[PDB]
Design a protein around this ligand. Sequence first.
Ligand SMILES: O=S1(=O)CC[C@@H]1CNc1ncnc2[nH]c3cc(F)ccc3c12
Length: 167
Amino acid sequence: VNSFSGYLKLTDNVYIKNADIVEEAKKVKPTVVVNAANVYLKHGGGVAGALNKATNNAMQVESDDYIATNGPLKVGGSCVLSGHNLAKHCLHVVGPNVNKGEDIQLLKSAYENFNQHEVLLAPLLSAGIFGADPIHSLRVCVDTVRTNVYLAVFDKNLYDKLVSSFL
Ligand SMILES: O=S1(=O)CC[C@@H]1CNc1ncnc2[nH]c3cc(F)ccc3c12
């Protein structure tokens, strides 16, 4: 039993809710919140900008030190950093950004990072400003993640479309 509330169950292990991931993280305090990161951990907009703003820029400060030490992530890769006031940990995962021409097949590799964590609060990878089709992202999620994932979809119209079209 966990504290996630109001989710629709899609499969054995995948759940979905129309929610603001920032507000959801603030209420649940999950062990892991996933950020929709880029390789430079520059949290300027989308989910990343929202999560970073909610940490009063502490996420960005920590991220800049991470990059200065380790260099950029790979597209499809991830790193674990602090969850600050939102979660115990933040799993920064880099989905391909279609608006940069990155290969969509890397979306499966990106979701594989979730399997290293038993339970996660997450957005749909490569959705929003990353330019992928969220219906496709949900399908890859369901077919790749085996651990327990609670998906927050900010846009109510999109949430209803994802549910109604789910196979
Ligand atoms: O859901 S969508 O709009 C349709 C694709 C987008 C995915 N992005 C998100 N997914 C979940 N929670 C979220 N909270 C946010 C706060 C912001 F300021 C900007 C984006 C988000 C967001």
